[PDB]
UniProtKB/Swiss-Prot annotation:
Subunit structure: Interacts with ABL1. Interacts with RasGAP and INPP5D/SHIP1. Interacts directly with phosphorylated ITGB3. Interacts with SRMS (via the SH2 and SH3 domains).
Origin superkingdom: Eukaryota
Gene: DOK1
Entry's family note: Belongs to the DOK family. Type A subfamily.
Domain IRS-type PTB stretches: 3-99
Stated name of the protein: Docking protein 1
Role this protein plays: DOK proteins are enzymatically inert adaptor or scaffolding proteins. They provide a docking platform for the assembly of multimolecular signaling complexes. DOK1 appears to be a negative regulator of the insulin signaling pathway. Modulates integrin activation by competing with talin for the same binding site on ITGB3.
PTM info: Constitutively tyrosine-phosphorylated. Phosphorylated by TEC. Phosphorylated by LYN. Phosphorylated on tyrosine residues by the insulin receptor kinase. Results in the negative regulation of the insulin signaling pathway. Phosphorylated on tyrosine residues by SRMS.
Tissues of expression: Expressed in pancreas, heart, leukocyte and spleen. Expressed in both resting and activated peripheral blood T-cells. Expressed in breast cancer.
Free-text comment about domains: The PTB domain mediates receptor interaction.
Length: 99
């Protein structure tokens, strides 16, 4: 009921370093935002409203999005290793289309 959830592993980017992101997380595709969660059970860390994203994309090894300046994380690129990048991408495209 909270949205589709995927285990991911963060890759080094400026924004990920600034936000202290390292290792594995759940990325959840919600109705109006993405949320990053860690094990405490799952605890939320950051959320990015779709309206505040610049772009997003994927290949067979990763999923990546770029946050604008108004996100709580600050602006920049967040990239995550996953073999489910197309699944995340489709979930996000769909949630944005529904919005």
């Amino acid at each position: 009921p909270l949205g589709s959830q995927f285990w991911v592993t963060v890759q080094r980017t400026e924004a990920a370093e600034r936000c202290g992101l390292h290792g594995s997380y759940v990325l959840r595709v919600e109705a109006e935002r993405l949320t990053l969660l860690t094990v405490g059970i799952l605890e939320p860390l950051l959320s990015w409203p779709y309206t505040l994203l610049r772009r997003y994309g994927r290949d067979k090894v990763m999923f990546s999005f770029e946050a604008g300046r108004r996100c709580p994380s600050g602006p920049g690129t967040f990239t995550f290793q996953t073999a489910q990048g197309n699944d995340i991408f489709q979930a996000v495209e769909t949630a944005i289309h529904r919005q």
